[PDB]
Every structure is written in C-alpha cells, then in structure tokens.
Design a protein around this ligand. Structure first.
Ligand SMILES: Cn1c(=O)[nH]c(=O)c2c1nc(Sc1nc3ccc(NC(=O)CC[C@@H](N)C(=O)O)cc3[nH]1)n2Cc1ccccc1
Ligand SMILES: [Fe+3]
Length: 291
C-alpha cells in the first residue's frame, strides 16, 4: 500500500518535524561538540524551526558578529572562484540576490527575504528545518517547491569546513539555482516522483538528487561547470571538481543511483549533466521504471 504523503503545502507541517536527528544533537567529531555556548545557539535555531508552521513568516534572526565574520570569510573566497567555476545560471542569479536580499560580506541574508524572492521568481519557498529528515520527507517538500533549509551558522573555529549543511551552504549553494526556472522544474519533479513512492524508489531518487542538486557538474559551451550546491559552498572541493584530477562520468540515473553518497570526504566521482532540461528528461524516463 502507498505510504502517507503530503497533498498540499501545509501538510509539510506533519513531516517537516519528523526529525531523525535534531540539529542540536552534534556528532562526536563536530567542531562545536565541546562548545556549550554554540550548543545553546544551535538549540535556539532548532527550536525556531520546530515551532514554525506553514504560513508563518520565517523568524528573522539577529546573527552575532562572530557568525557574520564566518559568513564573510566563506563568502569572500567563494566569490573569487564562482566566475571561473560556476554554471551560467548561477552567475546570472547571484547578483540579483546581492541586490534584493542583502548578500554581502558583512551581512547574512534572512531566510524570509530569500524565500519571498524565490516565490516571485520560480514559486520556490523556504522552510526552516530543525535537523535531518528522512529522504522521503525531505524530497516531499520539493514537490511543493519548498526547500527545507538550515538557519544556523557553522562553528567559527573553521569557516572553511562543515560536516553538515549550514545556512552558508543553503544561501550560497542552493538559493541561486532555485531562482532559475529550468532548475526549479527539475527539482520539483524529483519531489513529485518521490510522493508515495516505494522506499527503494525514494532512495534512488535521493541519490540522483545528491549527484545533481548537491554535487552535479554540467557542460556549457564545451566547458565543465559546477551547479551542485555542496560544491558551490566548499572552497576546496569546488576547485578539485574542475581540477583535472577528479573522476567524471555522464549523468545516467540507472548508473548514478548505484553510487554511494559521501558526506565527510570529496566525492569519488562527479556526474555531468548536459543541461538542466536534459537531466530533467532523463529523470522522467527513469521514474517510469521505478514507480
Ligand atoms: C537526502 N536528504 C535526506 O534524506 N534528509 C535530509 O534531511 C536532507 C537530505 N538532503 C538534504 S540537503 C543536503 N544534504 C547534504 C549533505 C552534505 C552536504 N555537503 C556539503 O555541503 C559539503 C560541504 C562541506 N564538506 C564543506 O566543508 O563545505 C550538503 C548537503 N545538503 N537534507 C537536509 C538536511 C538538513 C539537515 C541536515 C542534513 C540534511
Ligand atoms: Fe544541500
């Protein structure tokens, strides 16, 4: 029988809080693991997300000077690399975000502002999320053009590394492409495909999502470019991915879905999509075979 799935955007209220691992529950190896002040700050962010209901404005947060410095450090360096590394759609949308959502080195954009911007451009919206969700629940958000988004900032001891998504990853990695209609469509259809799907199918969709939305490369005017959010927010892997020393294969869902998703190291392999339109077409054919 078909498992429960959200049927309208407010139904995400019921699965968004089905958190498998709370945001405040840091793994032994976390840079802030021994920091009780950062631990409290994380509990504050997790509580904001848990209390959030669809329809609410996303609570605005006053970021500390230390958090803003961490953002600025990350921001400053990544921006040096984007012109020579990022896909054209990313480069087109990022200056719009600087203009309308206050992206700059000395300011962390508010999720509410970014959500209102996306709603206008592609109908995407943001939902703050406490911590890790099941792949079923995370992907179901995309069905309604909702991106579940972390609001906290990585620990300041190491601005260039995070074991997990933080809101620097969300704002710099994900948001510029959610503002692109072809990418938004591609993403939504991953979500739509997942709704009520078997566990098996959900896992394969989540792996395809990982190797496009999070670590994807594309070919544009004969060049390899980056569109994966996990690359776009990581100084070291962004450079590595286009370095010439990375393994690279064509995006092909039946093959890609067999690949392991690595969380604490560089990927072993990156997949190249011809275009967002082509990736979308390939997923449509793939979904027929698993659903
Ligand atoms: C498939 N899936 C699920 O099943 N459940 C989710 O809740 C989920 C999800 N996918 C995402 S989105 C997402 N998962 C990620 C994993 C890794 C990375 N890696 C990096 O950013 C590298 C950066 C670093 N090396 C550096 O130093 O910069 C980016 C990710 N983006 N989430 C939301 C979620 C919210 C909170 C916590 C986890 C996940
Ligand atoms: Fe991500």
């Amino acid at each position: 029988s078909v498992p429960w799935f959200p049927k309208k955007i407010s139904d995400l209220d019921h699965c968004a809080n089905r958190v498998l691992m709370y945001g405040s529950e840091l793994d032994a190896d976390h840079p802030g693991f021994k920091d009780n002040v950062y631990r409290k700050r994380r509990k504050y962010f997790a509580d904001l997300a848990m209390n959030y209901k669809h329809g609410d404005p996303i609570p605005k947060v006053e970021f500390t000077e230390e958090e803003i410095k961490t953002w600025g450090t990350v921001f400053q360096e990544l921006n040096k690399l984007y012109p020579t590394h990022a896909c054209r759609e990313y480069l087109k949308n990022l200056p719009l975000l600087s203009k309308y959502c206050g992206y700059r080195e000395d300011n962390i954009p508010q999720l509410e502002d970014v959500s209102n911007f996306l709603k206008e451009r592609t109908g995407f919206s943001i939902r703050p999320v406490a911590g890790y969700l099941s792949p079923r629940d995370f992907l179901s958000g995309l069905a309604f053009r909702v991106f579940h988004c972390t609001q906290y900032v990585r620990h300041s001891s190491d601005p260039f590394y995070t074991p997990e998504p933080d809101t620097c990853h969300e704002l710099l990695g994900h948001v510029p492409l959610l503002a692109e209609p072809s990418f938004a469509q591609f993403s939504q259809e991953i979500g739509l495909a997942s709704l009520g799907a078997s566990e098996e199918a959900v896992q394969k969709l989540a792996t395809c999502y990982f190797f496009t939305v999070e670590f994807g490369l594309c070919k544009q005017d004969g060049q390899l470019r980056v569109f994966g959010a996990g690359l776009l927010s990581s100084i070291s892997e962004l450079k590595h991915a286009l370095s010439g020393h990375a393994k690279v294969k064509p995006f092909d869902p039946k093959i890609t879905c067999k690949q392991e998703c690595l969380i604490t190291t560089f990927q072993d392999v990156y997949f190249v999509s011809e275009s967002f339109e082509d990736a979308k077409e390939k997923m449509r054919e793939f979904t027929k075979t698993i659903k």
